[PDB]
Amino acid sequence: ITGTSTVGVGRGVLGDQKNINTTYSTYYYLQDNTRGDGIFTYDAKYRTTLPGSLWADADNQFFASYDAPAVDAHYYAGVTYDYYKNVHNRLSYDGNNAAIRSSVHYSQGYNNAFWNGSEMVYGDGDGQTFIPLSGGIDVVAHELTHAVTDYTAGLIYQNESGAINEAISDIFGTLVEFYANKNPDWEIGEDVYTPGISGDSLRSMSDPAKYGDPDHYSKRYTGTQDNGGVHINSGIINKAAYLISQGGTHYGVSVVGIGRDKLGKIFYRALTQYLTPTSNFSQLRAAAVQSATDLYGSTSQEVASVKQAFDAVGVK
Ligand SMILES: [Ca+2]
Ligand SMILES: [Ca+2]
Ligand SMILES: [Ca+2]
Ligand SMILES: [Ca+2]
Ligand SMILES: [Zn+2]
C-alpha cells in the first residue's frame, strides 16, 4: 500500500506489549516499510486461500485477541530480518531485500507453520497442542530460514539433505532466539507447544533423545516416513551444532565449545558457500570444516572442535 510510515502498539500471543511498524492510508496496515522492500502481514480469516487480505486496522492499537498472532508474525519477521542483516550482512532471504509476506489465521485449528516457497503461513493451533505458532520466535526464524536455504544451498526436502535443511532451520531459529534474548534455550517451539504442560518442546538440540530423536548417526531413522526422516534425523546435526557451540562429552568424545557466534559464522558460510541441493551428512562435515578453516585457520581450535563434534555424533 502507498501511505505514511508510522508506529503502532499491540499485544503478542503471550500477552507481551510491543511496538510494530505500520503504514497509514485511511486504515493502518501491517506493512513495515523500514526493512528492505517491506514486511507485509495478512489475514487468512480461517481459510486456506493465500495470502488473504493485507491486515488493516482502524486505530493502530492491536490489543484484540484476534490481532495477537498478526502482531507477532509481523514483529518477529522484522527481528529475523535484523538478525540476518546485522550479523550476516544479508538483506532479506534472497539477498536483495525481497519483501517478506506472512498470513495468519490460516485454516481452523491448524497445528503447523510453514514457508510455502513464496511466503510464511501460520495456523492458530487447536489450543491444546499449540497456541498460535507465530508466538514462537524460534518457530518464525526457523521457517524464514527455509527461505534463505532455498535461495542459497537449495537443499532438497528429503533423506539426509532434508535433515540438514531442517537442522539449519533449528540452528538459525535458536540463534535468532538468543539474538533477541527472548528467554533463550536450545529447545524448539517451547513458547507455543502444549500450553497445559510446562518444560517440554517439539525437539531438543542439546539432547535430541529426550523426545526420541537420534543423537548419533548409528541411530538414524532409515524408513520412508517423514520424507526419509527429515524431522527425525535432524537431531544428529542439531546435537553436533550444540556441541560445537557449548562443548560437552557425547558417547565418550569430548568437544571444547567455541560459542554461538562462531557457530553461526561457520554454518552460514557452509550454507551459502559449500552446500548443494543433494549434500549428505558427510559433505556437511566437509563443508563445515572448510568454512571454519577459511575463517579461523586449519590449525585453529575452531576447526578442531568442528571435527570433534562430528566425530562425537558419528559423522565421518
Ligand atoms: Ca485496533
Ligand atoms: Ca526460549
Ligand atoms: Ca527455543
Ligand atoms: Ca508446553
Ligand atoms: Zn523446517
Swiss-Prot record:
It catalyses: Preferential cleavage: Xaa-|-Leu > Xaa-|-Phe. Ca(2+) 2 binds at D138, E177, D185, E187, E190. It comes from Bacillus thermoproteolyticus. It is found in: Secreted. This is Thermolysin. Keywords: Calcium, Hydrolase, Metal-binding, Metalloprotease, Protease, Secreted, Signal, Zinc, Zymogen. GO terms for cellular component: extracellular region. Its EC number is 3.4.24.27. The keyword Transcription does not apply. The active site is at E143, H231 (proton donor).
